[PDB]
DNA sequence: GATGTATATATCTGACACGTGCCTGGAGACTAGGGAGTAATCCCCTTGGCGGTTAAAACGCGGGGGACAGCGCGTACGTGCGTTTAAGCGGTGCTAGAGCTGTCTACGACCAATTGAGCGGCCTCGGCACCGGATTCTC
DNA sequence: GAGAATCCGGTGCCGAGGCCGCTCAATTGGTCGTAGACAGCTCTAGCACCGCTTAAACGCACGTACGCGCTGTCCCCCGCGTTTTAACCGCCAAGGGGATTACTCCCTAGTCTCCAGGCACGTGTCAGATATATACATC
């Protein structure tokens, strides 16, 4: 009966009302848009984590760790231009070498 | 008593070779001494602000990672 | 008594892989994630709020957001996904 | 003047609790009383201590009277700190005292920030300021001695900053007329104790 | 040469400014920007200061490289990061 | 019906200056000049309503905002100026 | 029968900068010493940079102040380009800048 | 010379150095591939905004990337410099 | 062909995935009142087109100006190697400082009357934009 | 040592500032709930320091790989003159829809009430880290 799961979502949605109440974004909060909120939220989660699980499992480890998240943004496109100005703690950076 | 030279000879060298660069020259030991320190301005003095606002004598993670996402360069991993 | 976002995350993985695992502090990473994207797109339409002259957030406002904040294909994949789970949620 | 001292006597004031704030400002004895009238007493303490630093803008400030505020501030706030209790052996005026000892510290180190203050059964109460031969000397963090001239004991304040220990001991040893200094195992938080678990031995020898 | 130096940089993730004396320099910064008070630094935010000074030093020096091989160079000269600021602004 | 911040700047420009006049377009760069400084300003300040967990903006936030979205030595004047207009605000 | 900005000894308005700052949902409660500090900030920045602008246009012997009379006023200050960075004043133009 | 008269003309005056209908129906051909079908009406001063928008931007980048030409001891621009001037920034 | 270069395993070491207790924030219910969605309307701002001019763009051409390629001297930089200095571990102390739990009070939302400060429309007239004229400058 | 650049003057023209009507939004004033300043107490986590120890920096000597100035060559933009062309100005019609008002209704907010979920705590135990030792890749 919970609304995360009425919706067949994984993201809470009670959590996301209460930050959008008291948040200061606007006077009235509607019903059909956190549920909105959180989809796309889970759907972006789970946009980065398959790919950082691709890459953590290529490198023959069974561990999630910063580096894997540095290669697979800086490796997609789409997430080099959202993500485009953050630095990421025990990050690294891709392999780069050039000659003349 | 030099007080920016805990940034070495080689520090500079190991940064540089994490960027990628073949051949460091000389008064490059001289010019990133005087860049580093300048941004470090402008992260501390936009970080002891947040913190003299909250009357708290202590620089927390979150008042540097608020300073760092107001100047541009957000940064996620702590917090 | 300090809540965050981990167990939803490790919800998430743990769907969509089998047993993989992540550590500890990659986790506070997601966390600074998703704690940032819901401060740029519900804060964000809260501006087309103010432009238009309302006061309240509909998921027509949220919808316009994410056609704005993200980039082109991911964009589309978002809003189709989104309104289909709110088609969901209308029929409950 | 410079714009150092004014962010200290600005920090010491916020400390002080608006229940006796006007007994440590008639106690200081550093502005007139005229202007203790112009200032409101009754608004929140995030304004009346930027007038009272307006009307310390004006007239008159040091180092010394802001170090003097502090002494006094400490004296009654003695709950805080925890003391350490030192006694002289092996061996007069308090000006001869003073002077000795403010000389052999400058002539220690390069900075250091001295501050005396006179107090009845001819105590004194010096505040020193630690600092290095190429840094300003830390007003945040004082030691503190209460020296009597009769009992050859002395009062000590811990602090985070070691090291000056003992040459603060052998400086004061050496300022004083006497060769020996001790260093007991009475370490507690107030100041009656010990002075009850020395003075029942010495005046009773 | 030195090419056995990077492919082993561009593989671990460690800090390489120490601990220590990046922690002196930002408590004699701090000191200057407060009036002459000191402060009391978490153990996590020194962290995230040299994770930061880390990641725009090497951004830095990747876009002054990339300046380099425009002009023919391969060495980098005090020219070269002086003007790789003033573009980005 | 339609307000904007067009007389106020010709009052300030008669003040420091005596017969300058000023057209009718750059006048207009001045409203998005001055409903663009007090959407920072008041934007950012409203945020450290929220980092603090408080619900007011009192003149201490606007100050340290104005500490912040400003250059150095013109915000040492506008910090030196605002309180010397609060103070003679309050004794009304 | 008293005006906001008469106490304030300022010019610009104080009720107008109150009414926006509770309608702009900022935050649920608004101080009452707030917009008369923050509308005097807004003074005496607009002060500042007509205050450099007329220097600059009695320079070029006119009295009307046109736009590239503050693109040249905003440009030429130190600490107004650190301000007005990614700005780009419309009828603007450059500076003459050369080699 | 010619050139150097150039420069200092072109730099005192403040005009709109593209012509209105070509620029007017570039943003139209690009406004109609997008939500196809209807059209789409311009307000007479959107067009002049978005005009002097892309003046603005396009005087600022030149101006940006010709340092790059008087650092390799060149006199000339290459679509190198201008192709490493947005790689620089990272638009 | 010796120096890397990848792999087997040793074990050891601690983070971490997991299980439990538990406090409190999320769900059910329902009234109520302002937000707004739909309907109509009328003007007002935009679109389309005729037509004539006039600056403005396109196109050949040649000529100097500059980019590019090779090259020699040399000097400023990498590397090898002994020292010596400062950085890390780690351990102790140990106390200033976050924070958080009550309180009580000044203070800001909330609301009815009322009036002038500021907005819309109008009308010049001086400031200014342009056009033509008289006084300097480098090749 | 004279066409080109700079200052100056005259004249139309048109928007900038003064002026009036007015209306609605800012002022004044009295009411009440409560947000937050203020004090004091409690755990904790940051700083100072010290002994060791040892990993890395420091200083230097030297060989040599690029930096740079020079110069020859060849190609390639810019100024110029002629022809062509479409941008613009001003007008004129017309009509699509932008802004305004009404009106009902419905949907979110507030308060109360009940309990299931997400967080802090604690613990065995597998993943990897580093370390040594041994089978391939190579200028």
């Known amino acids: 009966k919970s609304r995360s799961s009425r919706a067949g979502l994984q993201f809470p949605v009670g959590r996301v009302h209460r930050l959008l109440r008291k948040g200061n974004y606007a006077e009235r909060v509607g019903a059909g848009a956190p549920v909105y909120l959180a989809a796309v939220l889970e759907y972006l989660t789970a946009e980065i984590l398959e790919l950082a699980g691709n890459a953590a499992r290529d490198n023959k480890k069974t561990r999630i760790i910063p580096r894997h998240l540095q290669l697979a943004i800086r490796n997609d496109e789409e997430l080099n231009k959202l993500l485009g100005r953050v630095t990421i703690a025990q990050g690294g950076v891709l392999p780069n070498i050039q000659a003349v | 008593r030099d007080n920016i030279q805990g940034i070495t000879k080689p520090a500079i060298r190991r940064l540089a070779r994490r960027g990628g660069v073949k051949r460091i020259s000389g008064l490059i030991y001289e010019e990133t001494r005087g860049v580093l320190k300048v941004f470090l301005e402008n992260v501390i003095r936009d970080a002891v602000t947040y913190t003299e606002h909250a009357k708290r004598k202590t620089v927390t993670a979150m008042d540097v990672v608020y300073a760092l996402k107001r100047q541009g360069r957000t940064l996620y991993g702590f917090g | ?92 | 003047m410079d714009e150092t001292v004014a962010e200290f006597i600005k920090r010491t004031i916020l400390k002080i609790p608006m229940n006796e704030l006007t007994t440590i400002l008639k106690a200081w004895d550093f502005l007139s009383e005229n202007q203790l009238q112009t200032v409101n007493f009754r608004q929140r303490k995030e304004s009346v201590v930027q007038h009272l630093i307006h009307l310390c803008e004006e007239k008159r400030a040091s180092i010394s009277d802001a170090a003097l505020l502090d002494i006094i501030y400490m004296q009654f706030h003695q709950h805080q700190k925890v003391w350490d209790v030192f006694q002289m052996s092996k061996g007069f005026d308090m000006k001869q005292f003073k002077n000795s000892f403010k000389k052999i510290l400058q002539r220690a180190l390069k900075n250091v920030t001295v501050s005396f203050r006179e107090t009845e059964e001819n105590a004194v109460w010096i505040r020193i300021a630690w600092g290095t031969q190429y840094t300003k000397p830390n007003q945040y963090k004082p030691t503190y001695v209460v020296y009597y001239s009769q009992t050859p004991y002395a009062f000590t304040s811990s602090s985070m900053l070691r090291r000056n220990t003992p040459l603060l001991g052998q400086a004061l040893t050496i300022a004083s007329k006497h060769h020996q200094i001790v260093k007991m195992d009475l370490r507690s938080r107030y100041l009656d104790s010990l002075k009850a678990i020395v003075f029942k031995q010495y005046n009773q020898t | 040469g030195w090419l056995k130096e990077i492919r082993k940089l561009q593989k671990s993730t460690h800090l390489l400014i120490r601990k220590l004396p990046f922690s002196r320099l930002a408590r004699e910064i701090c000191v200057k920007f407060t009036r002459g008070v000191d402060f009391n630094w978490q153990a996590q935010a020194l962290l995230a200061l040299q994770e930061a000074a880390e990641a725009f030093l090497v951004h830095l020096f990747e876009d002054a490289y990339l300046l380099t091989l425009h002009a023919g160079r391969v060495t980098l000269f005090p020219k070269d990061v002086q003007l790789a600021r003033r573009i980005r602004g």
């Open chain 3, 1 to 92: 008594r300090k809540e965050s976002y981990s167990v939803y995350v490790y919800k998430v993985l743990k769907q969509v892989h089998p047993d993989t695992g992540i550590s500890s502090k990659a986790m506070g990473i997601m966390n600074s994630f998703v704690n940032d994207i819901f401060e740029r797109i519900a804060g964000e339409a809260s501006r087309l709020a103010h432009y238009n002259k309302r006061s309240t957030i509909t998921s027509r406002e949220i919808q316009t957001a994410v056609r704005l904040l993200l980039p082109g294909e991911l964009a589309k994949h978002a809003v189709s996904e989104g309104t289909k789970a709110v088609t969901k949620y209308t029929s409950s």
